[PDB]
Write an enzyme that holds these catalytic residues in place. Structure first.
Site, PDB file in Angstrom:
ATOM      1  N   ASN A   1       0.801  -1.224   0.000  1.00 67.50           N
ATOM      2  CA  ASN A   1       0.000   0.000   0.000  1.00 67.50           C
ATOM      3  C   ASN A   1       0.830   1.268   0.000  1.00 67.50           C
ATOM      4  O   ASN A   1       1.943   1.340   0.557  1.00 67.50           O
ATOM      5  CB  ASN A   1      -0.949   0.026   1.205  1.00 67.50           C
ATOM      6  CG  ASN A   1      -0.288   0.576   2.459  1.00 67.50           C
ATOM      7  OD1 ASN A   1      -0.311   1.785   2.714  1.00 67.50           O
ATOM      8  ND2 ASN A   1       0.302  -0.312   3.253  1.00 67.50           N
TER       9      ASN A   1
ATOM     10  N   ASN B   1       6.090  -1.517  11.424  1.00 65.40           N
ATOM     11  CA  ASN B   1       5.363  -1.043  10.260  1.00 65.40           C
ATOM     12  C   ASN B   1       5.706  -1.901   9.028  1.00 65.40           C
ATOM     13  O   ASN B   1       6.456  -2.876   9.128  1.00 65.40           O
ATOM     14  CB  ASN B   1       5.709   0.417   9.998  1.00 65.40           C
ATOM     15  CG  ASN B   1       4.533   1.214   9.456  1.00 65.40           C
ATOM     16  OD1 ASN B   1       3.854   0.794   8.515  1.00 65.40           O
ATOM     17  ND2 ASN B   1       4.287   2.370  10.053  1.00 65.40           N
TER      18      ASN B   1
ATOM     19  N   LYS C   1       6.372   3.692  16.999  1.00 66.07           N
ATOM     20  CA  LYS C   1       6.255   2.624  16.005  1.00 66.07           C
ATOM     21  C   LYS C   1       7.343   2.777  14.963  1.00 66.07           C
ATOM     22  O   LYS C   1       7.504   3.835  14.351  1.00 66.07           O
ATOM     23  CB  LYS C   1       4.893   2.625  15.325  1.00 66.07           C
ATOM     24  CG  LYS C   1       4.694   1.479  14.316  1.00 66.07           C
ATOM     25  CD  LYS C   1       3.223   1.358  13.921  1.00 66.07           C
ATOM     26  CE  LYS C   1       2.981   0.234  12.927  1.00 66.07           C
ATOM     27  NZ  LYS C   1       1.541   0.173  12.584  1.00 66.07           N
TER      28      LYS C   1
ATOM     29  N   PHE D   1      -1.464   8.329   4.156  1.00 68.99           N
ATOM     30  CA  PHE D   1      -2.115   8.938   5.309  1.00 68.99           C
ATOM     31  C   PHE D   1      -3.369   9.722   4.930  1.00 68.99           C
ATOM     32  O   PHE D   1      -3.553  10.874   5.332  1.00 68.99           O
ATOM     33  CB  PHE D   1      -1.137   9.835   6.059  1.00 68.99           C
ATOM     34  CG  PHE D   1      -0.019   9.070   6.716  1.00 68.99           C
ATOM     35  CD1 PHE D   1      -0.199   8.520   7.967  1.00 68.99           C
ATOM     36  CD2 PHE D   1       1.184   8.855   6.064  1.00 68.99           C
ATOM     37  CE1 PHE D   1       0.813   7.811   8.593  1.00 68.99           C
ATOM     38  CE2 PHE D   1       2.194   8.142   6.684  1.00 68.99           C
ATOM     39  CZ  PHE D   1       1.992   7.622   7.956  1.00 68.99           C
TER      40      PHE D   1
ATOM     41  N   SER E   1       6.460   5.262   8.763  1.00 68.25           N
ATOM     42  CA  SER E   1       5.650   5.030   7.564  1.00 68.25           C
ATOM     43  C   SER E   1       6.403   5.326   6.269  1.00 68.25           C
ATOM     44  O   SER E   1       7.091   6.342   6.170  1.00 68.25           O
ATOM     45  CB  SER E   1       4.395   5.863   7.581  1.00 68.25           C
ATOM     46  OG  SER E   1       3.644   5.628   6.402  1.00 68.25           O
TER      47      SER E   1
ATOM     48  N   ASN F   1       5.243   6.131   3.250  1.00 70.37           N
ATOM     49  CA  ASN F   1       4.475   6.852   2.230  1.00 70.37           C
ATOM     50  C   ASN F   1       4.227   8.327   2.543  1.00 70.37           C
ATOM     51  O   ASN F   1       3.292   8.932   2.015  1.00 70.37           O
ATOM     52  CB  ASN F   1       3.137   6.148   2.012  1.00 70.37           C
ATOM     53  CG  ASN F   1       3.304   4.667   1.746  1.00 70.37           C
ATOM     54  OD1 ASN F   1       4.177   4.253   0.978  1.00 70.37           O
ATOM     55  ND2 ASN F   1       2.483   3.857   2.397  1.00 70.37           N
ATOM     56  N   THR F   2       5.066   8.898   3.402  1.00 70.27           N
ATOM     57  CA  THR F   2       5.087  10.342   3.618  1.00 70.27           C
ATOM     58  C   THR F   2       6.545  10.789   3.585  1.00 70.27           C
ATOM     59  O   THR F   2       7.362  10.341   4.391  1.00 70.27           O
ATOM     60  CB  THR F   2       4.399  10.745   4.951  1.00 70.27           C
ATOM     61  OG1 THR F   2       2.986  10.831   4.741  1.00 70.27           O
ATOM     62  CG2 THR F   2       4.885  12.102   5.462  1.00 70.27           C
TER      63      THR F   2
HETATM   64  C1  LIG Z   1      -3.392  -1.020   3.797  1.00 73.40           C
HETATM   65  C2  LIG Z   1      -2.538  -0.748   5.005  1.00 73.40           C
HETATM   66  C3  LIG Z   1      -2.618   0.494   5.619  1.00 73.40           C
HETATM   67  C4  LIG Z   1      -1.848   0.780   6.749  1.00 73.40           C
HETATM   68  N1  LIG Z   1      -1.928   2.018   7.359  1.00 73.40           N
HETATM   69  C5  LIG Z   1      -1.182   2.283   8.497  1.00 73.40           C
HETATM   70  C6  LIG Z   1      -1.271   3.515   9.155  1.00 73.40           C
HETATM   71  O1  LIG Z   1      -2.053   4.411   8.795  1.00 73.40           O
HETATM   72  N2  LIG Z   1      -0.486   3.743  10.257  1.00 73.40           N
HETATM   73  C7  LIG Z   1       0.373   2.774  10.748  1.00 73.40           C
HETATM   74  O2  LIG Z   1       1.070   2.977  11.741  1.00 73.40           O
HETATM   75  N3  LIG Z   1       0.458   1.567  10.114  1.00 73.40           N
HETATM   76  C8  LIG Z   1      -0.301   1.312   8.991  1.00 73.40           C
HETATM   77  N4  LIG Z   1      -0.205   0.085   8.381  1.00 73.40           N
HETATM   78  C9  LIG Z   1       0.755  -0.946   8.921  1.00 73.40           C
HETATM   79  C10 LIG Z   1       0.118  -1.985   9.818  1.00 73.40           C
HETATM   80  O3  LIG Z   1      -0.300  -1.300  10.977  1.00 73.40           O
HETATM   81  C11 LIG Z   1       1.145  -3.042  10.205  1.00 73.40           C
HETATM   82  O4  LIG Z   1       2.204  -2.401  10.895  1.00 73.40           O
HETATM   83  C12 LIG Z   1       1.707  -3.802   9.000  1.00 73.40           C
HETATM   84  O5  LIG Z   1       0.736  -3.887   7.974  1.00 73.40           O
HETATM   85  C13 LIG Z   1       2.228  -5.192   9.356  1.00 73.40           C
HETATM   86  O6  LIG Z   1       1.218  -6.033   9.884  1.00 73.40           O
HETATM   87  P1  LIG Z   1       0.511  -7.126   8.936  1.00 73.40           P
HETATM   88  O7  LIG Z   1       1.583  -7.894   8.202  1.00 73.40           O
HETATM   89  O8  LIG Z   1      -0.251  -8.042   9.866  1.00 73.40           O
HETATM   90  O9  LIG Z   1      -0.395  -6.373   7.953  1.00 73.40           O
HETATM   91  C14 LIG Z   1      -0.984  -0.185   7.265  1.00 73.40           C
HETATM   92  C15 LIG Z   1      -0.902  -1.425   6.644  1.00 73.40           C
HETATM   93  C16 LIG Z   1      -1.664  -1.703   5.527  1.00 73.40           C
HETATM   94  C17 LIG Z   1      -1.535  -3.062   4.907  1.00 73.40           C
HETATM   95  O1  LIG Z   2      -1.202   5.579   5.081  1.00 71.73           O
HETATM   96  C1  LIG Z   2      -0.316   4.952   4.527  1.00 71.73           C
HETATM   97  O2  LIG Z   2       0.156   4.893   3.390  1.00 71.73           O
HETATM   98  C2  LIG Z   2       0.545   3.985   5.516  1.00 71.73           C
HETATM   99  C3  LIG Z   2       0.940   4.523   6.769  1.00 71.73           C
HETATM  100  C4  LIG Z   2       1.806   3.606   7.608  1.00 71.73           C
HETATM  101  O3  LIG Z   2       2.199   3.970   8.717  1.00 71.73           O
HETATM  102  N1  LIG Z   2       2.114   2.377   7.092  1.00 71.73           N
HETATM  103  C5  LIG Z   2       1.739   1.884   5.864  1.00 71.73           C
HETATM  104  O4  LIG Z   2       2.014   0.810   5.374  1.00 71.73           O
HETATM  105  N2  LIG Z   2       0.901   2.823   5.080  1.00 71.73           N
END
Ligand SMILES: Cc1cc2nc3c(=O)[nH]c(=O)nc-3n(C[C@H](O)[C@H](O)[C@H](O)COP(=O)(O)O)c2cc1C
Ligand SMILES: O=C(O)c1cc(=O)[nH]c(=O)[nH]1
Ligand SMILES: O=C1c2ccccc2C(=O)c2c1nnn2-c1cc(F)c(-c2cc(CO)ccc2F)c(F)c1
Ligand SMILES: CCCCCCCCCCCC[N+](C)(C)[O-]
Ligand code: NA
Ligand code: NA
Ligand code: NA
EC number: 1.3.5.2
Length: 365
Positions: A115, A254, A225, A119, A185, A187-188
């Site tokens: 992804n 993350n 994080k 944000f 993150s 993507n910023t």
């Molecule tokens: C579509 C998507 C959006 C995410 N958005 C955020 C986010 O806004 N803030 C954040 O700290 N992590 C975000 N994450 C990261 C998840 O919180 C997590 O750290 C990461 O996906 C690993 O866990 P997983 O393998 O179980 O998905 C996002 C992950 C995905 C897949």
């Molecule tokens: O909003 C997003 O693109 C995003 C934020 C984040 O902390 N981690 C991630 O995978 N996506």
């Protein structure tokens, strides 16, 4: 239990995925969840899944990671799904749309997602009012062992990152059991550079000052994080600052901007953060390292590629007090939460642990 699990995994989820692009599927998932359109999980949480950490009781150690419910729209549905805790966000100070579509990609051959949402956020004010509308309900949930976390982001156009995070502390801190600041993150632009030391100390000092300024019953724990993509130097520096300042915990990890060898998905070279199975052991190793660098005295929430009891226990034994998942939900659907809890309970018994607490950091001993 195992009936719904197999039906979702083999039939329903592959079908939804065949009909819906990933972002549409995500939106539908949030909608269903917010409406409670899911089986009220039959798995009764046993006592050996209970964890006391971060100043709170957690009925079970399996949470929903940030980014699923970015705007706080489905919190009660997520508890209904069986999560022991819920983390919403990331939330930015002002509303912002995030990146152009497409920005979410499935790698089914890898059980991964990429992804680059960027944000997308309804903003602090909208989320503040949404949480205020259920504030007392949450107070009771928290007391019953179901805490709420809020992940704080910053706006793309922000001139001062520390002030964005400070605003988040002031506005949503009073509504949260814990707050999260990413230095992580993908993507910023420039966000991850908040990982460097003297500047990181400055940032986190300001965040903690703001937190300490809140009234006692409205004063949340503060966690940092991190990404899995840090240098050894980065990790040492973060561990040092965290201990120096009294940061309450770490979330590890993350998504990764790396692309591990062996990815098969056609969309593997899309820009963004990779989640799911290819992240799993990179995450677990980062937990192991951060636990050791902090002498096991700093609670860690472990996250990345968890979809089974074995995955969860590996992170707990590596040093995690709690775990989260997200991407597994997108492949297995809601039954995956009960699956992980049931499998985790069985493995704890099999390996001779009295409960989750006994297993935390066990590999280091
Ligand atoms: C579509 C998507 C959006 C995410 N958005 C955020 C986010 O806004 N803030 C954040 O700290 N992590 C975000 N994450 C990261 C998840 O919180 C997590 O750290 C990461 O996906 C690993 O866990 P997983 O393998 O179980 O998905 C996002 C992950 C995905 C897949
Ligand atoms: O909003 C997003 O693109 C995003 C934020 C984040 O902390 N981690 C991630 O995978 N996506
Ligand atoms: O590719 C992605 C994806 C990519 C990136 C982020 C999220 C997702 C994501 O959530 C997703 C994807 N593909 N399917 N889903 C998905 C996952 C679910 F869990 C449900 C769901 C179903 C019910 C029915 O009882 C109740 C509650 C639910 F949440 C759902 F409808 C769709
Ligand atoms: C050490 C680097 C390895 C990079 C990623 C490792 C992925 C492990 C593969 C197991 C995942 C299961 N599946 C169905 C998604 O293929
Ligand atoms: Na509350
Ligand atoms: Na609190
Ligand atoms: Na280094």
């Amino acid at each position: 239990a195992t009936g719904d699990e197999r039906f979702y995994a083999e039939h329903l989820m592959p079908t939804l995925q065949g009909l819906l692009d990933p972002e549409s599927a995500h939106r539908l998932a949030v909608r269903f969840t917010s409406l409670g359109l899911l089986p009220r999980a039959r798995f009764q949480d046993s006592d050996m899944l209970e964890v006391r950490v971060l100043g709170h009781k957690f009925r079970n150690p399996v949470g929903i990671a940030a980014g699923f419910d970015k705007h706080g729209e489905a919190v009660d549905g997520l508890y209904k799904m069986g999560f022991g805790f819920v983390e919403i966000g990331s939330v930015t100070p002002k509303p912002q749309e995030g990146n152009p579509r497409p920005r979410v990609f499935r790698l089914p051959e890898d059980q991964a997602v990429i992804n680059r949402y960027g944000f997308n956020s309804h903003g602090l004010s909208v989320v503040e009012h949404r949480l205020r509308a259920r504030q007392q309900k949450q107070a009771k949930l928290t007391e019953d062992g179901l805490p709420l976390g809020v992940n704080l982001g910053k706006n793309k156009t922000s001139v001062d990152a520390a002030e964005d995070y400070a605003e988040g502390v002031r506005v949503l801190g009073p509504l949260a059991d814990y707050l999260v600041v990413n230095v992580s993150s993908p993507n910023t632009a420039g966000l991850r550079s908040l990982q460097g030391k003297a500047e990181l100390r400055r940032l986190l000092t300001k965040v903690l000052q703001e937190r300490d300024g809140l009234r006692r019953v409205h004063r949340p724990a503060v966690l940092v994080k991190i990404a899995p993509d840090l240098t050894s130097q980065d990790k040492e520096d973060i561990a040092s600052v965290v201990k120096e300042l009294g940061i309450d915990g770490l979330i590890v990890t993350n998504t990764t901007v790396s692309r591990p060898a062996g990815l098969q998905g056609a969309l593997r070279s899309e820009t963004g953060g990779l989640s799911g199975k290819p992240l799993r052991d990179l995450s677990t190793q980062t937990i192991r390292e951060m636990y050791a660098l902090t002498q096991g005295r700093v609670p860690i929430i472990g996250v990345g590629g968890v979809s089974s009891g074995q995955d969860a226990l590996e992170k707990i034994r590596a040093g995690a007090s709690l775990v989260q998942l997200y991407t597994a939900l997108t492949f297995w659907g809601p039954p995956v939460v009960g699956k992980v809890k049931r499998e985790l309970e069985a493995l704890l018994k099999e390996q001779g642990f009295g409960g989750v607490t006994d297993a935390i950091g066990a590999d280091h001993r």
